[PDB]
């Protein structure tokens, strides 16, 4: 039968270990699970499998653009802030807004600035002007885990455009991840 | 009977008058999460007694193996443990050619020499224990060019010998674990010495285990052109180590009577 | 959207005490989802965290 | 002969109390031999009992 513990009478100091799926009942109540869709939208793989805006850059010349990639404190991706460590594939969505040219894109977790001077070794997929690509950067991280908060939690992204004439433009960036491994959930964030 | 009996009566009475809809009340009685118990925890030479314990906690689906499966440190897991038994340089000295037979080249206080400086692998632990019981493995090294010749006596002298050293006849020291090592023939001597004393344990930071010495069997015959600076080095390893008596940091404690 | 409901904690029996015990105590209210909890559509953000 | 060792009892957490309880208590230290205790040679006496 039902114990008084499952009826509401408990002790907060007896909750450890963390993660106790204890059932709560009353005479007219029972945990009822109802699913409205064929799958879950709470699973890390599904939720995060959907991109979210990151930042935009306007380029008037080929100069290279390197930006630290970090988890959002803004979109649905904020749900990541509930975790401390991450590891796994990283989907980067880049849009090249230009009239005539090409955009070199590359990703590295390496903090050294110089390693990115010769962009070709790193990757540098090519998005023709007016096209958008989605490259999935692997976990080539020199650190087993990525503190999820760091201003560079995610590796740096490189964008250099091979323009042809006076043409200029702007590069919008969106980020998403493939199968994410989060660990050791930390306390919920505050609001600004 | 009572006060334990109530969940059943209420649960039952509710049960008896139940109609088509069912009972209109359920009652369950049991013991509180915070029961009258006592917990005891023991770590190395420690015991924590608590009479008001609480449910221990821990992270989600935790792994306490504590072993890095990637081996970011490619060392034997027991490296830190065995570290203090590691081979180390106990002494170095330059034999002077003029020295007569039977002269003492160099000596090392045993066993406190393994904690000779704070830079000794064993110095760390040796501090937190007053008693010691260990075995030794010495390797006295002496290098000399082929042109030169000579011989040194590497011998282990227990406290008994060290005490009455002058009363003993040199040339008979070959009765003790030694290595008459003829230069120009051997560059190193090996000596395996077990725990030797008249007491089960020796005070840490003491010379009671005796001391290893190096004498002049036959003085160095160094030709004219040949070099004249021969160095004698004493290396030591602990075949087996054992620190028992706990004590304050490096405080002289008397294990003896 | 719409509130979850009205939450009220009324006094039933005055907190009793004695010479060496407090005449008033502190209380904490926590909240969590049930074992049948579910979330469905991800939407935009209404606030910015830090 | 040589002492058995240094015996020290330090305070870890101040003895708490209330209006009707003592602010300090009495303590007693007893001593006995373990189940592996043994004595060996009988010797002369160093003191005289009564």
Residues of A in contact with B60 (CB under 8 A): 18-19, 184-185
Cβ pairs B/D, distance under 8 A: 4
DSSP-H helix ranges across chain B: 7-16, 79-82, 123-126, 159-163
Judge: C19–D19 Cβ closer than 8 Å, yes or no. yes
Q: Please tell me the distance in Å from A158's CA to the nearest CA on chain C.
A: 26
Judge: A1–B61 Cβ closer than 8 Å, yes or no. no
Per-residue tokens: B22: 């069912």
Helix (H, G, I), strand (E, B) or coil at A65: strand
What is the end-to-end Cα distance of chain C in Å, rounded? 23
Handedness of CA B64, A142, A112, A147 (dihedral sign): negative
Judge: B55–A13 Cβ closer than 8 Å, yes or no. yes
- Distance, in Å, from the CA atom of B107 to the CA atom of B211, rounded to the nearest integer, reads 7
Residue A177 has φ and ψ, to the nearest 5°, of -130, 150
Q: How many helices (H) and strands (E) does chain D have?
A: 0, 0
The torsion region of residue B130 among left (phi > 0), alpha (psi -120 to 50) and beta comes to: alpha
Contact (CB, 8 A) for B210 and B110: yes
- Distance, in Å, from the CA atom of A26 to the CA atom of A6, rounded to the nearest integer, reads 9
Cβ pairs C/D, distance under 8 A: 7
Q: Please tell me the distance in Å from D11's CA to the nearest CA on chain B.
A: 14
Judge: B254–D2 Cβ closer than 8 Å, yes or no. yes
Name the strand (E) or helix (H) holding A47: helix A44-47
Show the CA angle centred on residue A156, arms to residues A150 and A159, nearest 5°: 150
Q: CA of A49: which chain C residue's CA is closest?
A: C42
Q: Please tell me the distance in Å from A12's CA to the nearest CA on chain C.
A: 10
C20, C22, C23: best to mutate for the D interface, most D CBs within 10 A:
C20
CA A184 to chain centre: 17
Q: Max alpha carbon distance in chain D (Å)?
A: 56
C40, C49, C50: best to mutate for the A interface, most A CBs within 10 A:
C49
Contact (CB, 8 A) for A68 and A151: yes
Contact (CB, 8 A) for A152 and A70: yes
Judge: A42–C49 Cβ closer than 8 Å, yes or no. no
C23 touches chain D (CB under 8 A): no
Judge: B60–A18 Cβ closer than 8 Å, yes or no. yes
A74 touches chain C (CB under 8 A): yes
Which residues numbered 3-62 in A keep a CB inside 8 Å of some CB on C?
Answer: 21, 23-24, 31-37, 40-42, 47, 50
Helix (H, G, I), strand (E, B) or coil at B216: strand
Residues of D in contact with B257 (CB under 8 A): 1-2
A5 touches chain B (CB under 8 A): yes
Of B11, B29, B57, the CB nearest to A17: B57
Method of determination? X-ray
Task: For chain A, give every domain's residue range.
Answer: 1-192
CA B60 to chain centre: 37
Q: CA of A4: which chain B residue's CA is closest?
A: B28
What is the end-to-end Cα distance of chain D in Å, rounded? 23
A71, A73, A82: best to mutate for the C interface, most C CBs within 10 A:
A73
Of A40, A42, A191, the CB nearest to C48: A191
Per-residue tokens: A92: 């980067």
- Distance, in Å, from the CA atom of B183 to the CA atom of B38, rounded to the nearest integer, reads 70
Give the up-direction half-sphere exposure of residue B200: CA atoms within 13 A in the CB hemisphere: 5
- Distance, in Å, from the CA atom of B239 to the CA atom of B200, rounded to the nearest integer, reads 17
Residue B224 has φ and ψ, to the nearest 5°, of -55, -65
- Distance, in Å, from the CA atom of B91 to the CA atom of B212, rounded to the nearest integer, reads 10
Contact (CB, 8 A) for B95 and B216: yes
Per-residue tokens: B109: 């206080």
């Amino acid at each position: 039968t039902m114990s008084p513990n499952e009826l509401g009478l408990t002790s907060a100091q007896d909750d450890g270990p963390l993660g106790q799926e204890k059932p709560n009942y009353f005479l007219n109540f029972r945990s009822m699970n109802v699913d409205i869709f064929t799958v879950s939208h709470t699973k890390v793989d599904n939720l995060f499998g959907r991109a979210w805006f990151f930042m935009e850059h306007t380029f008037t010349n080929e100069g290279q653009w390197r930006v630290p990639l970090e988890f959002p404190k803004q979109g649905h991706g904020s749900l990541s802030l509930l975790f401390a460590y991450f590891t796994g594939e990283l989907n980067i969505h880049v849009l090249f807004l230009s009239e005539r040219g090409f955009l070199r894109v590359a990703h590295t977790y390496d903090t050294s600035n110089d390693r990115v001077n010769f962009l070709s070794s790193n990757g540098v997929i090519t998005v023709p002007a007016g096209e958008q690509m989605t490259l999935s950067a692997p976990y080539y991280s020199n650190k087993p885990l990525r503190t999820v908060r760091d201003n560079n939690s995610l590796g740096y992204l490189m964008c250099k455009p091979f323009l042809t004439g006076t043409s200029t433009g702007k590069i919008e960036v969106y980020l998403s991840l493939r199968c994410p491994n989060f660990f050791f959930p930390l306390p919920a964030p505050k609001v600004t | 009977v009572g006060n334990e009996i109530g969940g059943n009566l209420l649960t039952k009475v509710a049960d008896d008058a139940s109609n088509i809809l069912g009972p209109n009340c359920f009652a369950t009685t049991a013991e509180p999460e915070n029961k009258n118990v006592v917990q005891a925890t023991t770590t190395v030479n420690t015991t924590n007694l608590t009479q008001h314990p609480s449910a221990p906690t821990m992270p989600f689906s935790p792994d306490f193996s504590n072993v890095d499966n990637f081996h970011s440190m490619a060392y034997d897991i027991t490296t830190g443990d065995k570290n203090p038994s590691k081979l180390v340089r106990l002494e170095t000295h330059e034999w002077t050619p003029s020295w007569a037979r039977g002269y003492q080249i160099t000596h090392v206080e045993l066993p406190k020499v393994f904690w000779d400086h704070q830079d000794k692998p064993a110095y760390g632990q040796s501090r937190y224990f007053a008693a010691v019981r260990c075995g030794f493995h010495f390797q006295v090294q002496v290098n000399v060019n082929q042109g030169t010749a000579g011989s040194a006596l590497v011998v282990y002298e227990p406290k008994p010998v060290v005490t009455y050293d002058s009363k003993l006849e040199f040339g008979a020291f070959t009765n003790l674990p030694h290595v008459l090592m003829n230069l120009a023939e051997t560059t190193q001597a090996d000596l395996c010495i077990p725990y030797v004393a008249d007491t089960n344990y020796v005070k840490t930071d003491s010379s009671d285990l005796g001391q290893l010495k190096v004498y002049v069997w036959t003085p160095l015959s160094i030709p004219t052109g040949s070099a004249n600076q021969v160095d004698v080095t004493i290396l030591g390893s602990l075949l087996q180590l054992d620190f028992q008596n706990p004590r304050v940091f490096a405080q002289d404690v008397n294990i003896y009577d | 959207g719409h509130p979850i409901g009205l939450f009220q904690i009324e006094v039933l029996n005055r907190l009793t005490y004695n010479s060496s015990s407090p005449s008033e105590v502190y209380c904490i209210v926590q909240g969590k989802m049930g074992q049948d909890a579910r979330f469905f559509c991800p939407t935009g953000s209404v606030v910015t965290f830090q």
